[PDB]
Short mmCIF file of C-alpha atoms in Angstrom, two decimals:
data_model
loop_
_atom_site.label_atom_id
_atom_site.label_comp_id
_atom_site.label_asym_id
_atom_site.label_seq_id
_atom_site.Cartn_x
_atom_site.Cartn_y
_atom_site.Cartn_z
CA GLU A 1 106.11 95.08 52.17
CA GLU A 2 104.68 92.76 55.02
CA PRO A 3 103.72 93.45 58.33
CA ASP A 4 105.35 91.31 61.81
CA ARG A 5 103.10 89.18 63.17
CA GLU A 6 105.21 87.77 66.12
CA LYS A 7 105.54 91.16 67.58
CA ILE A 8 101.97 92.13 69.53
CA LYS A 9 99.84 88.91 70.21
CA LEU A 10 96.49 89.11 71.69
CA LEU A 11 96.05 86.38 73.84
CA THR A 12 91.89 85.09 72.86
CA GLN A 13 92.38 82.34 76.09
CA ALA A 14 92.26 86.09 78.14
CA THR A 15 90.04 88.39 76.39
CA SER A 16 87.06 89.85 77.59
CA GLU A 17 84.14 88.65 75.44
CA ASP A 18 83.57 91.73 73.92
CA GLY A 19 85.38 93.62 74.17
CA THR A 20 87.31 95.79 77.17
CA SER A 21 90.05 93.63 78.70
CA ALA A 22 92.41 91.73 77.41
CA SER A 23 96.35 90.88 77.73
CA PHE A 24 98.86 91.35 75.29
CA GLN A 25 101.88 89.27 74.70
CA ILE A 26 105.26 91.08 73.20
CA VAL A 27 108.33 89.74 72.38
CA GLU A 28 111.91 91.12 72.69
CA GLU A 29 110.11 93.63 75.70
CA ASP A 30 110.61 93.97 78.91
CA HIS A 31 110.40 96.15 81.88
CA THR A 32 112.17 99.20 79.54
CA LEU A 33 108.66 99.20 77.27
CA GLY A 34 106.63 97.77 80.00
CA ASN A 35 106.68 99.71 83.12
CA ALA A 36 106.49 103.30 80.67
CA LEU A 37 103.80 102.05 78.42
CA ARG A 38 101.41 100.80 81.58
CA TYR A 39 102.02 104.01 83.41
CA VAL A 40 101.17 106.01 80.31
CA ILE A 41 97.89 103.47 80.01
CA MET A 42 97.07 103.81 83.39
CA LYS A 43 96.60 107.79 82.63
CA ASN A 44 93.42 106.92 80.75
CA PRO A 45 90.53 107.58 82.45
CA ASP A 46 88.68 105.08 80.48
CA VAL A 47 90.94 102.11 81.78
CA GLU A 48 90.08 100.42 85.15
CA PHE A 49 93.18 97.71 85.49
CA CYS A 50 96.59 97.99 84.02
CA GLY A 51 99.74 96.98 84.69
CA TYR A 52 102.73 94.33 82.94
CA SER A 53 104.37 91.29 83.71
CA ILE A 54 107.07 89.47 82.96
CA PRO A 55 106.06 85.40 82.76
CA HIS A 56 109.65 84.15 83.11
CA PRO A 57 113.63 86.32 82.43
CA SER A 58 114.97 83.23 80.32
CA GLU A 59 111.79 83.60 77.91
CA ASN A 60 111.80 86.91 75.53
CA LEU A 61 108.36 87.74 76.48
CA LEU A 62 106.34 90.92 77.78
CA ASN A 63 102.41 90.20 79.21
CA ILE A 64 100.15 93.88 79.75
CA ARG A 65 96.86 93.64 80.93
CA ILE A 66 94.48 96.59 79.90
CA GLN A 67 90.51 96.09 81.85
CA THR A 68 89.16 99.30 80.87
CA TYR A 69 85.15 100.91 81.53
CA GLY A 70 82.93 100.90 78.62
CA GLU A 71 82.32 103.17 75.76
CA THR A 72 86.38 102.22 74.89
CA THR A 73 87.98 98.50 73.47
CA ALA A 74 91.30 97.19 75.36
CA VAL A 75 92.80 97.43 72.31
CA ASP A 76 92.10 101.21 71.96
CA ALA A 77 93.72 101.72 75.24
CA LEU A 78 96.82 99.99 74.23
CA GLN A 79 96.69 101.86 70.74
CA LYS A 80 96.53 105.31 72.49
CA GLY A 81 99.33 104.30 75.34
CA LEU A 82 101.46 104.27 72.43
CA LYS A 83 100.76 107.09 70.76
CA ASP A 84 100.51 109.32 73.61
CA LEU A 85 104.05 107.50 74.77
CA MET A 86 105.02 108.53 71.06
CA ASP A 87 104.68 112.20 71.80
CA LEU A 88 105.73 112.40 75.19
CA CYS A 89 109.27 111.70 74.32
CA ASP A 90 108.53 114.28 71.52
CA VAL A 91 108.27 116.92 74.65
CA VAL A 92 111.40 115.64 76.13
CA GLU A 93 113.46 115.31 72.47
CA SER A 94 112.19 119.32 72.32
CA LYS A 95 112.71 120.28 75.61
CA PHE A 96 116.40 118.82 75.60
CA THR A 97 117.60 120.34 72.01
CA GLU A 98 115.69 123.74 73.34
CA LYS A 99 118.06 124.30 76.87
CA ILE A 100 121.19 122.38 75.10
CA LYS A 101 120.56 126.23 72.29
CA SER A 102 119.62 128.11 76.29
CA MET A 103 123.49 127.33 77.92
CA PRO B 1 107.20 58.43 80.95
CA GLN B 2 105.55 56.61 77.46
CA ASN B 3 102.29 57.09 77.78
CA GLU B 4 98.88 57.94 78.76
CA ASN B 5 97.90 55.50 81.68
CA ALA B 6 101.65 56.54 83.07
CA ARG B 7 101.31 60.24 82.31
CA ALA B 8 97.35 60.22 84.83
CA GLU B 9 99.43 58.76 86.92
CA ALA B 10 102.22 61.30 87.15
CA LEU B 11 99.20 64.18 87.12
CA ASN B 12 96.95 62.30 89.62
CA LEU B 13 98.61 60.93 91.88
CA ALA B 14 102.76 61.18 92.37
CA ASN B 15 102.10 65.25 91.48
CA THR B 16 103.52 67.61 93.22
CA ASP B 17 99.88 69.06 94.46
CA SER B 18 98.97 66.14 96.16
CA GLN B 19 101.94 65.46 98.18
CA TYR B 20 101.22 68.56 100.55
CA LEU B 21 100.82 66.88 103.36
CA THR B 22 103.79 63.84 104.48
CA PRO B 23 101.67 60.79 105.35
CA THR B 24 104.42 60.65 108.33
CA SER B 25 102.57 62.93 110.05
CA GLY B 26 99.38 64.43 107.84
CA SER B 27 101.74 67.94 107.74
CA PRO B 28 102.78 70.48 105.68
CA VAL B 29 106.34 69.98 103.41
CA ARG B 30 105.82 72.41 101.17
CA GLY B 31 105.60 76.91 101.42
CA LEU B 32 108.31 79.31 100.40
CA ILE B 33 111.82 79.61 102.63
CA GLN B 34 113.37 83.22 102.80
CA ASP B 35 112.70 86.39 100.66
CA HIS B 36 109.57 85.60 100.53
CA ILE B 37 108.82 85.51 104.22
CA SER B 38 110.58 88.79 104.87
CA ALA B 39 108.95 90.27 102.71
CA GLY B 40 105.93 89.16 103.60
CA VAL B 41 106.66 91.13 107.52
CA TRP B 42 107.07 94.33 105.16
CA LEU B 43 103.87 93.96 102.38
CA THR B 44 101.43 92.78 105.68
CA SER B 45 102.48 95.69 107.71
CA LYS B 46 100.27 98.66 108.57
CA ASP B 47 102.80 100.80 107.63
CA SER B 48 103.04 99.41 103.93
CA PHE B 49 100.36 101.17 101.96
CA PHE B 50 99.80 101.44 97.37
CA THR B 51 98.53 103.62 95.11
CA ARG B 52 95.92 102.44 92.71
CA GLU B 53 99.28 102.04 90.01
CA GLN B 54 100.88 100.36 92.31
CA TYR B 55 98.45 98.27 93.62
CA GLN B 56 96.46 96.68 90.40
CA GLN B 57 100.73 95.97 89.68
CA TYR B 58 101.33 94.09 92.30
CA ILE B 59 97.85 91.99 91.52
CA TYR B 60 98.88 90.97 87.90
CA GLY B 61 102.38 90.76 88.48
CA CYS B 62 101.39 87.92 90.23
CA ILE B 63 98.13 86.93 88.79
CA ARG B 64 98.19 86.28 85.37
CA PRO B 65 94.27 85.18 83.41
CA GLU B 66 95.66 84.13 80.40
CA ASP B 67 98.81 81.56 82.24
CA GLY B 68 94.91 80.23 83.79
CA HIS B 69 95.63 81.79 87.65
CA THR B 70 91.58 83.28 87.34
CA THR B 71 88.45 81.53 88.46
CA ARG B 72 86.22 84.83 87.28
CA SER B 73 88.28 85.98 84.05
CA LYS B 74 88.13 89.12 84.58
CA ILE B 75 90.54 90.63 87.59
CA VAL B 76 88.23 91.78 90.37
CA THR B 77 89.81 94.59 92.52
CA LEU B 78 88.84 95.78 96.42
CA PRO B 79 87.58 99.15 96.97
CA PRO B 80 90.79 101.54 98.63
CA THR B 81 91.02 101.51 102.51
CA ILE B 82 91.70 105.17 102.14
CA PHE B 83 89.28 107.14 99.87
CA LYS B 84 90.37 110.68 101.58
CA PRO B 85 92.51 112.67 100.75
CA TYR B 86 94.65 110.25 98.62
CA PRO B 87 92.95 106.98 97.25
CA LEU B 88 95.16 104.46 98.68
CA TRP B 89 94.95 100.30 99.42
CA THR B 90 96.64 98.54 101.99
CA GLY B 91 99.42 95.47 102.03
CA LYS B 92 97.04 93.52 103.58
CA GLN B 93 94.22 94.08 100.52
CA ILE B 94 96.90 92.88 98.01
CA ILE B 95 96.38 89.22 99.89
CA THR B 96 92.62 89.75 99.96
CA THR B 97 92.81 90.49 96.21
CA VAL B 98 95.05 87.61 95.68
CA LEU B 99 92.74 85.28 97.64
CA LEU B 100 89.21 86.41 95.87
CA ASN B 101 91.20 86.03 92.31
CA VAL B 102 92.23 82.41 92.87
CA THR B 103 89.28 81.07 95.15
CA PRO B 104 86.39 79.70 93.23
CA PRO B 105 83.74 82.28 93.22
CA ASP B 106 80.55 79.82 94.33
CA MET B 107 82.31 79.26 97.79
CA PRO B 108 81.85 81.58 100.08
CA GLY B 109 86.00 83.65 102.12
CA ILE B 110 88.34 81.31 104.21
CA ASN B 111 87.35 82.43 107.92
CA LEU B 112 90.35 81.75 110.08
CA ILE B 113 91.85 83.20 112.93
CA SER B 114 95.23 81.74 113.68
CA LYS B 115 99.05 83.64 115.11
CA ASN B 116 102.19 84.61 114.50
CA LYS B 117 105.83 84.36 115.21
CA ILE B 118 106.53 87.92 115.77
CA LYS B 119 104.79 88.80 119.47
CA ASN B 120 102.35 92.15 119.55
CA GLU B 121 104.82 93.48 121.92
CA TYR B 122 107.66 94.31 118.66
CA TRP B 123 104.83 95.99 117.03
CA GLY B 124 103.95 98.92 119.81
CA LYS B 125 101.73 99.37 122.22
CA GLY B 126 97.85 98.42 121.35
CA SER B 127 98.51 96.21 118.27
CA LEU B 128 96.26 92.91 117.95
CA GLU B 129 99.41 92.04 114.79
CA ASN B 130 99.95 88.54 115.81
CA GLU B 131 96.22 87.61 115.73
CA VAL B 132 96.10 86.40 111.93
CA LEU B 133 92.78 87.13 111.00
CA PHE B 134 90.78 85.81 107.66
CA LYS B 135 87.18 86.94 107.52
CA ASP B 136 85.11 85.86 104.66
CA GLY B 137 88.59 85.46 103.05
CA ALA B 138 90.16 88.85 103.84
CA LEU B 139 92.60 89.71 105.77
CA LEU B 140 91.35 92.48 108.48
CA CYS B 141 94.49 91.54 111.40
CA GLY B 142 97.74 90.63 111.84
CA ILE B 143 100.93 89.87 109.30
CA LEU B 144 101.80 86.58 107.25
CA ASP B 145 104.81 85.16 108.81
CA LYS B 146 106.80 81.40 107.89
CA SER B 147 103.89 79.98 110.22
CA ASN C 1 72.19 107.30 105.48
CA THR C 2 74.20 107.57 108.64
CA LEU C 3 74.69 105.43 111.33
CA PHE C 4 76.87 106.82 114.38
CA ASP C 5 78.04 110.72 114.64
CA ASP C 6 79.78 112.00 117.39
CA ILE C 7 83.33 114.57 118.50
CA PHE C 8 85.37 113.10 120.34
CA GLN C 9 88.81 114.42 122.04
CA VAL C 10 92.33 112.75 121.53
CA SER C 11 94.46 111.72 124.66
CA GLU C 12 96.89 109.59 122.83
CA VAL C 13 99.19 109.47 118.79
CA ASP C 14 101.40 106.43 119.40
CA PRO C 15 103.54 105.11 116.22
CA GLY C 16 104.61 102.09 117.78
CA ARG C 17 107.29 101.64 115.48
CA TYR C 18 105.31 102.61 112.70
CA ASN C 19 106.66 105.81 110.46
CA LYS C 20 102.88 106.19 109.15
CA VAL C 21 99.97 104.97 111.47
CA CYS C 22 99.80 105.67 115.00
CA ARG C 23 96.78 104.48 117.50
CA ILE C 24 94.68 107.09 118.34
CA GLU C 25 92.97 106.67 122.44
CA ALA C 26 90.15 109.33 122.49
CA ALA C 27 86.50 110.03 124.53
CA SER C 28 83.62 112.04 123.37
CA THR C 29 82.75 115.57 124.67
CA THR C 30 78.93 114.82 124.74
CA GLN C 31 79.25 111.20 126.17
CA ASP C 32 80.70 109.97 129.36
CA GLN C 33 81.23 106.16 128.41
CA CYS C 34 81.75 106.46 125.09
CA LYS C 35 85.58 105.44 124.48
CA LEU C 36 88.19 105.29 120.81
CA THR C 37 90.92 103.27 119.81
CA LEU C 38 91.29 104.07 116.19
CA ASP C 39 94.29 103.80 113.73
CA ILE C 40 95.04 106.05 111.42
CA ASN C 41 97.69 107.33 108.40
CA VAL C 42 99.38 109.62 109.82
CA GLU C 43 101.36 110.68 106.56
CA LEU C 44 97.92 111.93 105.34
CA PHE C 45 95.91 113.34 108.13
CA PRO C 46 98.04 114.36 111.30
CA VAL C 47 96.23 114.26 114.46
CA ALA C 48 97.58 115.94 117.57
CA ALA C 49 97.79 115.07 121.31
CA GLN C 50 94.68 117.27 123.24
CA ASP C 51 92.98 117.36 119.40
CA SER C 52 88.74 117.53 118.16
CA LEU C 53 87.99 115.27 115.51
CA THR C 54 84.45 114.59 114.38
CA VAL C 55 84.47 111.06 113.89
CA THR C 56 81.51 109.83 111.91
CA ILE C 57 79.98 106.27 110.53
CA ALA C 58 77.79 106.24 107.59
CA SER C 59 76.25 103.16 105.46
CA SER C 60 77.46 104.92 101.84
CA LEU C 61 77.68 108.36 100.60
CA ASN C 62 74.50 110.66 99.47
CA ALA C 63 72.95 100.24 94.08
CA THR C 64 76.44 100.87 93.33
CA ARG C 65 78.68 98.40 91.19
CA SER C 66 81.56 98.72 91.96
CA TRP C 67 84.55 102.14 93.03
CA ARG C 68 85.38 104.41 90.18
CA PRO C 69 88.59 107.03 90.56
CA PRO C 70 87.17 110.66 91.03
CA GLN C 71 86.17 112.51 87.45
CA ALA C 72 84.66 115.67 86.54
CA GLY C 73 81.10 116.72 88.61
CA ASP C 74 80.72 113.82 90.95
CA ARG C 75 79.97 114.51 94.52
CA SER C 76 79.67 112.59 97.78
CA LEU C 77 79.54 112.40 101.46
CA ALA C 78 83.26 112.26 101.53
CA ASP C 79 83.23 116.02 100.37
CA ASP C 80 81.78 117.35 104.21
CA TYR C 81 85.00 115.62 105.99
CA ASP C 82 88.72 115.31 105.56
CA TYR C 83 89.92 111.67 106.10
CA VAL C 84 87.68 109.10 105.09
CA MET C 85 88.27 105.41 105.18
CA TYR C 86 86.28 102.35 104.08
CA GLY C 87 86.22 99.01 106.10
CA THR C 88 84.11 96.11 107.84
CA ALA C 89 82.47 94.78 111.60
CA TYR C 90 84.24 91.83 112.84
CA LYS C 91 83.23 91.25 116.46
CA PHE C 92 80.15 92.63 118.75
CA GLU C 93 81.75 92.48 122.20
CA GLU C 94 79.27 93.55 125.63
CA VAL C 95 81.10 95.25 128.94
CA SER C 96 78.40 94.72 131.50
CA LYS C 97 74.88 95.61 131.77
CA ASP C 98 74.00 97.80 128.57
CA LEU C 99 77.55 98.39 127.51
CA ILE C 100 78.47 97.13 124.63
CA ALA C 101 81.95 97.76 122.45
CA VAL C 102 82.07 97.41 118.21
CA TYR C 103 85.53 95.98 116.60
CA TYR C 104 85.55 97.50 112.86
CA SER C 105 88.84 96.49 110.04
CA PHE C 106 89.47 99.16 107.80
CA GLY C 107 92.21 96.99 106.58
CA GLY C 108 94.50 95.80 109.15
CA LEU C 109 94.01 99.60 110.53
CA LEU C 110 91.29 98.59 113.53
CA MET C 111 88.82 100.25 115.22
CA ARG C 112 87.17 100.18 118.91
CA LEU C 113 84.00 102.08 119.92
CA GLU C 114 82.74 101.95 123.10
CA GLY C 115 79.03 102.37 124.30
CA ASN C 116 75.59 101.39 124.93
CA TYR C 117 72.59 103.34 122.96
CA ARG C 118 74.39 102.35 119.49
CA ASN C 119 73.44 98.32 119.51
CA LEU C 120 70.61 99.16 116.69
CA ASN C 121 71.66 101.43 114.64
CA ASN C 122 75.59 99.67 114.10
CA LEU C 123 75.46 96.13 112.86
CA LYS C 124 78.53 94.06 111.60
CA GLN C 125 78.19 95.30 107.85
CA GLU C 126 80.22 94.40 105.23
CA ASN C 127 80.67 97.85 104.39
CA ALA C 128 80.90 101.19 107.09
CA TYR C 129 82.27 104.21 105.69
CA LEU C 130 84.34 106.07 108.50
CA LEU C 131 84.66 109.90 107.71
CA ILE C 132 86.56 112.39 110.34
CA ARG C 133 87.09 116.20 110.24
CA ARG C 134 88.82 119.36 111.56
CA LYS D 1 133.01 24.70 95.62
CA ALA D 2 136.05 23.92 93.08
CA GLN D 3 139.70 23.61 94.46
CA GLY D 4 141.87 26.34 93.81
CA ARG D 5 143.84 27.00 90.99
CA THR D 6 147.69 28.43 91.10
CA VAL D 7 140.97 35.33 91.60
CA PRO D 8 139.09 32.30 90.02
CA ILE D 9 136.23 32.75 86.91
CA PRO D 10 132.64 32.96 88.48
CA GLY D 11 130.19 30.47 88.16
CA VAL D 12 126.23 30.53 86.96
CA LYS D 13 126.06 31.11 91.14
CA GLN D 14 128.16 33.84 91.71
CA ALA D 15 126.75 35.40 87.68
CA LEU D 16 123.19 35.92 89.65
CA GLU D 17 125.44 37.40 92.96
CA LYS D 18 127.85 39.11 91.70
CA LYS D 19 126.99 42.11 94.28
CA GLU D 20 123.47 42.68 94.80
CA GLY D 21 122.77 40.90 92.42
CA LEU D 22 120.84 40.04 88.80
CA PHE D 23 117.88 40.00 90.90
CA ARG D 24 118.75 43.93 93.08
CA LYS D 25 120.80 45.09 90.32
CA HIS D 26 119.05 44.47 87.19
CA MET D 27 115.50 43.31 87.76
CA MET D 28 113.83 44.85 91.02
CA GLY D 29 115.63 48.24 89.45
CA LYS D 30 117.02 49.49 86.09
CA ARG D 31 118.78 51.52 83.99
CA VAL D 32 115.97 53.28 81.85
CA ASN D 33 115.10 55.19 78.62
CA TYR D 34 114.03 58.78 78.36
CA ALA D 35 115.85 60.36 81.29
CA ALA D 36 118.30 62.95 81.56
CA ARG D 37 120.16 64.40 84.51
CA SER D 38 121.71 67.66 85.57
CA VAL D 39 122.66 70.26 88.77
CA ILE D 40 118.97 72.13 89.68
CA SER D 41 119.40 75.74 90.21
CA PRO D 42 116.23 78.14 91.68
CA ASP D 43 113.48 79.23 90.38
CA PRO D 44 110.80 81.21 91.83
CA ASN D 45 109.30 82.60 88.44
CA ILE D 46 108.21 78.98 87.31
#
């Protein structure tokens, strides 16, 4: 087994010395995950600033900036965002299956 | 160009940024042309309000610290213009925040009293929306036109 | 602490081709020479003609680093009023003998208060909170 | 400066002044290496 290193990348040129602020770059992603992920990350009470930006349409890149308050790194805020979006999808999938039976 | 002396020249003498003003009259030949002008009249309008989520998105959408757009290595944000009931940011505040992150921190904010192409009469009774006002790098009055 | 406090009577509510903002023309119930011209987000806090508004100017809320969204157990001066705005004073004008008119901007949403005694308390501060009740 | 033969062959003076001239067409102006040409398309993301 080998993990892919080209997908998520931490832009060290923008990362806070430690540890709250960072800019992440994801390949083969756009508005689909982008707007959904920044929405979930913004629900975190520790996230100070969050937004997504696509550098250019021709290049397959997605940038997401997470600036938090203390006691939480930007990496943790991203990991919480992904973990919550997965659970959010489970809720959608569970409610849809139930209403199909309810018909 | 195939050498560093020719590179330095194309980056410091003949480069686009050093050609903002034409030597014919010393007037600008660089600026935004159509959608951007119509977008600005709407974005900087009094009626344009934005939530924390919306406001921060518009900031990072145009300013990316990783692409070296910032001067503070952290995106600084103004407090909302409306605190209670709901926290809301004005359209003009986005223009203040963009300048606050692109202009040097060591220097004070821009102070300018300019005018608009759109007369006050169009914006209703007692509006001062024609007077473009910048006090310490903050858009406090007037929309932004082709002007 | 507070810098100004008074109850005003609304004489005009004009949208002026705006769907969410309105220019309010008011006069003080206590002082005769006192007048007000203020832009408010009518979508959140609606104002009607012939209304009593308790307009109050404060320096802060009873050293802060930055604004944070509300979190359980936070007390503020804003908890006493309905609609609160944060803005700056940009112009100080004098109208004839003793009368002085101040100019405030809450991010495009302009305010013009006319009085006389407030010359000491009201100063051109890059931080001025405007709180309104009823 | 030569007699008519029943367009004549160009002389060395004609070679230096063919159209705009050797000086204008091949000294003051020249075709260059490391260069490209294409139709321009608008882009607000760059």
